[PDB]
């Protein structure tokens, strides 16, 4: 009756934060900002692949299904990270401790509209007082619930969805008795995450095609997987 | 302890079906198919505005907030309708009783990819054995949970979300004791609905800009509202 083991487990499995390391020799530009961001994403993708797979049941899926889930969910997982890191800030996005974007910098990078949607996600979670326990559980649910069209073992993926959903249910029933509908409210934040991810993928795909911003192999593989 | 009044109420508030009435004098073409579809959407938008509103609390919102919710959610509500009408079919979308699209017709209309996503929604709901009670409750939740950036009374909209969520919870606790997580599973279908809506809006906005397909005023107002 002290809280849910899956939640406890996801908390200890949480990766250490990564630095963006913008090149201090390079003049600030939209190209610099986008290059720095895509480089950070590439490195975070490695972390995410390693992180997944720790999710109970995930490593028992075929490598194909593991890949399918990751290829569908990666943008949502990246976005939920920057949202969480940004909860204590106002109108700023904490991509990394050394890379915090305000409205002006978003404009300069051509990301004002996209970043404003991310800020909408932040605003909603601030109102809800999203906890770390809830954040890690939602990242794992976003992975399991990512709607890949290419899944081999649909029943096994549904089972993963269920284990993680039950964990959220249990956590909320124990920790948040004042709100018998909090788990559901948390699940109801997922559509805006999906919407913002969908738009972010299209945006960076367009940037990929325009050919002006260098991108690493893994990030390109993940982008091209949609 | 017989089922939830909000669910009962949404069932009786369900609009009658509408016909597409493709013009039988016009040769089949992508233009004919898209014109017929946008015309059907325009007429369904009127129905949806009338339907909303019957949702408890909805008419008590400012006209601004009523409009904001409708302008954000309309595509999701239209899509959930064609999904529901299509549950008893295989690889076909029942836009209307007189307008059922198979894979070949989708290709001809340039909607193969979009319609395939809608078919993914259908497939998931078929597996879950979505009921009419659950369909109408999800349409109302999609309206309340539509993430407009323009809401005046955020607390009032959150209250609407909560009333409808509680209705789903209650319905599932009474009707589906075999699955204590069914309400949550239903909420977890909303991200794919949002994703498919997001893509459909962009697609028809592109068609709007290309200027080849005639569109009526209300449909244009709703499209331009995103
Ligand atoms: O932790 C993150 C989150 C998002 C990101 C990206 C991002 C996504 C959306 C956005 O509005 C800004 C940056 C960088 C650019 C490539 C896609 C992912 C990078 C690291
Ligand atoms: O009941 C509906 C549902 C969707 C539709 C549209 C639709 C949406 C998505 C899609 O893949 C096909 C048609 C018609 C074209 C204008 C947008 C809405 C019309 C009536």
Curated annotation (Swiss-Prot), chains A, B:
The protein's name: Estrogen-related receptor gamma
Keywords, ordered alphabetically: Acetylation, Activator, DNA-binding, Isopeptide bond, Metal-binding, Nucleus, Phosphoprotein, Receptor, Transcription, Transcription regulation, Ubl conjugation, Zinc, Zinc-finger
The UniProt record lists the keyword Zinc: yes
GO terms classed as biological process: positive regulation of cold-induced thermogenesis; positive regulation of transcription by RNA polymerase II; regulation of DNA-templated transcription; regulation of transcription by RNA polymerase II; retinoic acid receptor signaling pathway
Binding partners and assembly: Homodimer. Binds TLE1, PNRC1 and PNRC2. Binds GRIP1. Interacts with NRIP1, NCOA1 and NCOR2.
PTMs per UniProt: Acetylated by PCAF/KAT2 (in vitro).
Superkingdom of origin organism: Eukaryota
Location of the NR LBD domain: 2-226
Cellular location(s): Nucleus
First and last residues shown, out of full length: 232 to 457 of 458
GO cellular component entries: chromatin; nucleoplasm; nucleus
